[PDB]
Amino acid sequence: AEVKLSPRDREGIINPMYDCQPAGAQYAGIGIKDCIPLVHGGQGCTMFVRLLFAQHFKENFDVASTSLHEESAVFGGAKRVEEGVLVLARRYPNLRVIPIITTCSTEVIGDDIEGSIRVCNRALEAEFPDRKIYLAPVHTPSFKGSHVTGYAECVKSVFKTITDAHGKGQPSGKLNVFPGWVNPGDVVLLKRYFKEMDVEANIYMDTEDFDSPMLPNKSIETHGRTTVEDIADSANALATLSLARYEGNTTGELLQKTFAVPNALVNTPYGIKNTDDMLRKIAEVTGKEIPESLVRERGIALDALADLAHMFFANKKVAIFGHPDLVLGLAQFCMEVELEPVLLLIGDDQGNKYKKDPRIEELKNTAHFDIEIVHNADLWELEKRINAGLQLDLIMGHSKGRYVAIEANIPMVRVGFPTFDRAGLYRKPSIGYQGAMELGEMIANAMFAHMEYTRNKEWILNTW
Amino acid sequence: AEVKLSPRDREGIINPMYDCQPAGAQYAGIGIKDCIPLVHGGQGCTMFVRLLFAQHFKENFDVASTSLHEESAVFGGAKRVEEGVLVLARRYPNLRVIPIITTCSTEVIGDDIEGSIRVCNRALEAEFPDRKIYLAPVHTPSFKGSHVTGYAECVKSVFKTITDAHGKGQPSGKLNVFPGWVNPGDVVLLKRYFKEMDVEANIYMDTEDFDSPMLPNKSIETHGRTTVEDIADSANALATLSLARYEGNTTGELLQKTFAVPNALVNTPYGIKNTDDMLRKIAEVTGKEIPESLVRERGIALDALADLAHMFFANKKVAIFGHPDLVLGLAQFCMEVELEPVLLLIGDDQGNKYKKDPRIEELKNTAHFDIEIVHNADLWELEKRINAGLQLDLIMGHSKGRYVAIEANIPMVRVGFPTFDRAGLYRKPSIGYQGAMELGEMIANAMFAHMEYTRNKEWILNTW
Amino acid sequence: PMVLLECDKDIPERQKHIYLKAPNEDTREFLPIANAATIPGTLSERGCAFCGAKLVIGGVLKDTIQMIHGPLGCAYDTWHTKRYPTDNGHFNMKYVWSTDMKESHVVFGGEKRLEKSMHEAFDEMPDIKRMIVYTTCPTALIGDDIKAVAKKVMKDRPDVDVFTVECPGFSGVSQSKGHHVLNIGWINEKVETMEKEITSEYTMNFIGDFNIQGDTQLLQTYWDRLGIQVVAHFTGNGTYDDLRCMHQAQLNVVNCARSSGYIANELKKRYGIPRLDIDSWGFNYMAEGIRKICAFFGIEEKGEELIAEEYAKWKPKLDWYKERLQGKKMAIWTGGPRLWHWTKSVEDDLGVQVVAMSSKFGHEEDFEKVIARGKEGTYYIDDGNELEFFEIIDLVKPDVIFTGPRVGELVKKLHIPYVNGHGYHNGPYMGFEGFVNLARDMYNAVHNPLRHLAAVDIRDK
Numbered sequence A, B: 001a002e003v004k005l006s007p008r009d010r011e012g013i014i015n016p017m018y019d020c021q022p023a024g025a026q027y028a029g030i031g032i033k034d035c036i037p038l039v040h041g042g043q044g045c046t047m048f049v050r051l052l053f054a055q056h057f058k059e060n061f062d063v064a065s066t067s068l069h070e071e072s073a074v075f076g077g078a079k080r081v082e083e084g085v086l087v088l089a090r091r092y093p094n095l096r097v098i099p100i101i102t103t104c105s106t107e108v109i110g111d112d113i114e115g116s117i118r119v120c121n122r123a124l125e126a127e128f129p130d131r132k133i134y135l136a137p138v139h140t141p142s143f144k145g146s147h148v149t150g151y152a153e154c155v156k157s158v159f160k161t162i163t164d165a166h167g168k169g170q171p172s173g174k175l176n177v178f179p180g181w182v183n184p185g186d187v188v189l190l191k192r193y194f195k196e197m198d199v200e201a202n203i204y205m206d207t208e209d210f211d212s213p214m215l216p217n218k219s220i221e222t223h224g225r226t227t228v229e230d231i232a233d234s235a236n237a238l239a240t241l242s243l244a245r246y247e248g249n250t251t252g253e254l255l256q257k258t259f260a261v262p263n264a265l266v267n268t269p270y271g272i273k274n275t276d277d278m279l280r281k282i283a284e285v286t287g288k289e290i291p292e293s294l295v296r297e298r299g300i301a302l303d304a305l306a307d308l309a310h311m312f313f314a315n316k317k318v319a320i321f322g323h324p325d326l327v328l329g330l331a332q333f334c335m336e337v338e339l340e341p342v343l344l345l346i347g348d349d350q351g352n353k354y355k356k357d358p359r360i361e362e363l364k365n366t367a368h369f370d371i372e373i374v375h376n377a378d379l380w381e382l383e384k385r386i387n388a389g390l391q392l393d394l395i396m397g398h399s400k401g402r403y404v405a406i407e408a409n410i411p412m413v414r415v416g417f418p419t420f421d422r423a424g425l426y427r428k429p430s431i432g433y434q435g436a437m438e439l440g441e442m443i444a445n446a447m448f449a450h451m452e453y454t455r456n457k458e459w460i461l462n463t464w
Numbered sequence C: 001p002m003v004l005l006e007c008d009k010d011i012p013e014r015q016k017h018i019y020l021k022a023p024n025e026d027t028r029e030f031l032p033i034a035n036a037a038t039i040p041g042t043l044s045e046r047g048c049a050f051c052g053a054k055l056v057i058g059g060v061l062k063d064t065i066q067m068i069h070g071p072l073g074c075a076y077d078t079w080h081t082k083r084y085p086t087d088n089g090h091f092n093m094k095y096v097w098s099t100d101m102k103e104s105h106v107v108f109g110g111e112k113r114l115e116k117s118m119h120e121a122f123d124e125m126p127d128i129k130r131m132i133v134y135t136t137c138p139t140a141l142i143g144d145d146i147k148a149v150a151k152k153v154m155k156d157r158p159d160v161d162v163f164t165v166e167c168p169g170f171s172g173v174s175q176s177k178g179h180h181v182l183n184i185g186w187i188n189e190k191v192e193t194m195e196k197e198i199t200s201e202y203t204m205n206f207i208g209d210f211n212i213q214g215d216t217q218l219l220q221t222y223w224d225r226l227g228i229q230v231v232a233h234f235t236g237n238g239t240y241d242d243l244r245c246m247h248q249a250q251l252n253v254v255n256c257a258r259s260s261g262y263i264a265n266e267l268k269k270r271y272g273i274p275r276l277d278i279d280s281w282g283f284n285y286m287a288e289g290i291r292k293i294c295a296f297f298g299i300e301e302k303g304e305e306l307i308a309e310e311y312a313k314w315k316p317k318l319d320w321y322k323e324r325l326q327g328k329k330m331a332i333w334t335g336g337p338r339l340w341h342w343t344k345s346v347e348d349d350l351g352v353q354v355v356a357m358s359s360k361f362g363h364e365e366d367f368e369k370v371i372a373r374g375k376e377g378t379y380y381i382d383d384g385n386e387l388e389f390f391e392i393i394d395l396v397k398p399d400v401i402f403t404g405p406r407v408g409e410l411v412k413k414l415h416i417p418y419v420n421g422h423g424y425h426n427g428p429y430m431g432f433e434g435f436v437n438l439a440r441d442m443y444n445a446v447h448n449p450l451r452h453l454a455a456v457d458i459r460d461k
């Protein structure tokens, strides 16, 4: 079995898979309590991303703009950054953290972000002697990488900034956990696993409360739960568990280098084996046993998947697109349940890294069929392959690919970010044992509906 | 605004909504640990019901037959009962409870079940001196009522049998809870609610482990968790909370009459208000406060539903079929989210009771449109009304109605029993706050898929 | 020898139902007793005579009301449980009818309730003009004369035709009795009550095939290519009126000799139509069957052209599966015939070793067949029960079990995969392509990552 990597053969993009770096830096920042990111550039760079988050989560998140205009585009934008910092601090008395996120415009014009931070620190210390506001420089030119890389850059810069200020102190006894770019339901699941294992951990960022209640007292609780103090404490951890090579492992590496916190990168926990291996590594680093409750949740997942695999999934051809950790992990999950992930699409310029991902060899050693991995892909690359005759039984990806599946009449399961065209997906785990089960049942239910709509042996859904 | 009840106008049935009484009695019994029901009648009355359970749950459950053959139909079948009890006892050394369930055959021929029980009790006491087996007579002629009535009769008889044997003991401090005929996921939710409220409670029957794991040690855990001890302790409870008028309230009533355990019947907790009212009754009987965690789960439900109600649900016409407590409760849920449940179908001969149900008046004071409630309904009644021009946007019911929705091109959400044509529904709550949310999101997601397959403004699923 | 299982120490009559074939035995001394009474309380797999009439045979028809005279349970229980498609939108699977018998009909009689139901069914679906009425336990016990009601309905509604079956669930010991009653009534009453146009020099009935997942439609592609007219299929993808024309055929080809041999035997007795038994499951078996049909008709070259094309299309795939399935151990726990149609065909064509077989309702004839074709060291069980199944698993350690879904879901807990030996996984399973489909499902069932994952205890270091 041959797993072939190839790049997109076009210079241009049609139907981009990801957003640009600043968007991902905004996503990282909105998961911090008392944080309002400040995006240094034109207004669209902020407002379109606030909309994107509202599409995925059906919630508002606070992000501010420096409002670069023509004057500042010609003569420099440092005063827009500096004013924006001060306006934020003046109007939001509880604000503590401001990642200052660059854009294509402010990278091209060369504004000196670090210098503006010195200016702002002096101004803020004079104006607000009893406050401390953390300003983190986040360099995210949009003409490199993608929102995946921008998320990773922003996490790293905010951790560098806060841990530079606080340093190393008392050991905490806790794990640091970087799950990557996951849903609130994934964070809920991880918190349960650590609780059942009696392992204290901080999950960075803790986005559980993005799914916020509508409460009798009209309070707004739609915030990140990761605090300054949580972030600072990462220097004191027993170990870091990094779940996502492209979405936070570089922070785990920085904490290893700076503070001697050992980083353990594991496969992102999609599917059974990857979840097993994550829990094995947790046990190894903590000395805690895996509890019976997880053996049971695992078993329930396997029971559910066994009702589907040979009956409905075997020999079915799947295309998967999304963030690289998710694509690679879902392809591994698909093979556990006899699906055939023949086309994997990863959407950015990081192919030199992806060729070295150890999961590629893992996929080569477990595939019963050839796999094509297109990197630097756009979603036109999927559509064009289907137009040329690629026969797929299932697509797994985010909602901006929906018209490809709708028009080709292929069932599609919504995974990754953003999933705006279905309800509630942000609350459903995709990682872990429960998440494998939930994914498999979404796949089956999408196939079942498709059998009904297309009258394809719809009578068979009785005694499976 | 008129809520009108009317009977089916045909003598015959086309496409029955429910199974017969003995099938319901079997469902009651399989929730008891160390129980094998013995169905006194021809072999189909057992085997077809074991298949029905496998369709809903994708699991085996043990039920035995007395294998009534021609000679018993001429001379009586007592000896088949007596042999069947002994053969069970001899081959299943851990068996403790045997509900002896009658059928149409054995009701017609008049076999004396209580007399056979006395014979068996003597035989068992002699043969197995240090063993107790509880034989409960369950009279379930199939020519009246339905599997709903049979379920209630079996619960009552088992409770009578076991409490007659043990009596009243010391106060337990606990609630008895009869949720009715619900899924494992509904039981999981209820356990959580009582746990968060610090209320000790036995849920009768506790069917959580019907969703059993596939375990490394190959053990079989697909059993009811309700024990003899648990049942016998019902006599000592603080109070009974009955959630289903037609599915266990009469056992709560028996316990009140026999043991002075006060029974509180509440609306079955579909939707927000009914859940609110359940929790308030729990708080009243126990003196325990409703916890902040439930306020929050409620608020998360409401938040989710608010993203759907006026956009997608308002003025959409719904038909609902299923058990009476589920149909009436779901109609109330639908109104909370702006759906219009215009046709409610309830499938058996208990209309004299249904006309007195307090929920009918509740529906009359909340509806903005006329509701037809057809009792003694079959599913042909639904199809026929659609054929005659009834315009529906949604059907909610069990999977034996699937072809009606498929052929009429109407989205359908699977609720109630049996839901064999989709995966995992047994694990998803329908009751409570989380259940209301999960139901609403199933409805939206079914509508969303329908918009895509039918190209009905499918572009609108972007910025809702 | 005959085997007394540990679980049967207290029901030791079961020994006469279980044969373990050993070297040098005269099998005539070891034929299981079959088709005898069930032991109460055993968790036997058996069903009822009504099932055999309505669910298995009559209900297959595409154009016929299935009027179940009885309380509603018997109807509910036989609806959404079969996989016999049709070419008219699956009318047979979409609907079931009951007379909804109530207590007052037990007391006073159900004949007028039946009659009313019958007229309603024809009024509600005015394009349907054919009906079968079945008794069930209580309508038998109360003595309703459904034949007389049907006579009256036909007199009042001359455009309909109605057939009746007396099949209460307590009749016989199993579903088998329902097959017999239906087969003999049909031939006695309805065969030769109409005729159809004959369009070929070569005509046959195909007797004992119920179109599971399209089996009958797949075989029909063979008959059409050979230029053979099938007067009637009994009953896969059939019509009521085709079955009235069965006397016209030149040849009766039988697959299910258990459920449908009765009608073939009476067609031969009454009309002189010869009975040819074949195996329409199995790759090499299918070729033998086609060659026999074509030798009967004198179209042997056409048969060889068909067989050559089918082997070219399918044999390489079959052989790929044999290479992977060789030596695997299989159990078959189904009704009866599939034991003797599959034991040697999976061995010949796939290299699969059938180690244990159980028949719910087979007769001694079925055991004669299976034991003749089956292996030494294999267990042959009549009327097996659930505790036996566990004991047999421990004895023979199957790699795969072909059985119904509920048993499949039980043995999954033991990490043993299943294929649905009744309704199939991804069928059809008859014919050349079908046996490839069977092999594919067996392969995917056993070559399954979940099975290996289930065995791992993550707590072990």
Ligand code: CLF
Pocket (backbone or CB within 6 Å): A020, A021, A022, A041, A042, A043, A044, A045, A046, A048, A102, A103, A104, A105, A142
């Ligand atoms: S204000 Fe408007 S949306 Fe902003 S960049 Fe400017 S034209 Fe465009 Fe573009 S790639 Fe991303 S979103 Fe920006 S950082 Fe550049």
Ligand code: CLF
Pocket (backbone or CB within 6 Å): B020, B021, B022, B041, B042, B043, B044, B045, B046, B048, B102, B103, B104, B105, B142, C048, C049, C050, C051, C070, C071, C072, C073, C074, C075, C077, C135, C136, C137, C138, C167, C168, C169, C170
């Ligand atoms: S052995 Fe067979 S299935 Fe059983 S009754 Fe008899 S013909 Fe029928 Fe019918 S209504 Fe229910 S399922 Fe029974 S108790 Fe009667």
Ligand SMILES: [Mg+2]
Pocket (backbone or CB within 6 Å): A303, A304, B057, B058, B059, B211, B212
């Ligand atoms: Mg299961």
Ligand SMILES: [Mg+2]
Pocket (backbone or CB within 6 Å): A057, A058, A059, A211, A212, B303, B304
């Ligand atoms: Mg919300």
Ligand SMILES: [S]
Pocket (backbone or CB within 6 Å): C045, C046, C047, C048, C174, C175, C176, C360, C361
């Ligand atoms: S049977």
Ligand SMILES: [Zn+2]
Pocket (backbone or CB within 6 Å): A368, C447
């Ligand atoms: Zn392999």
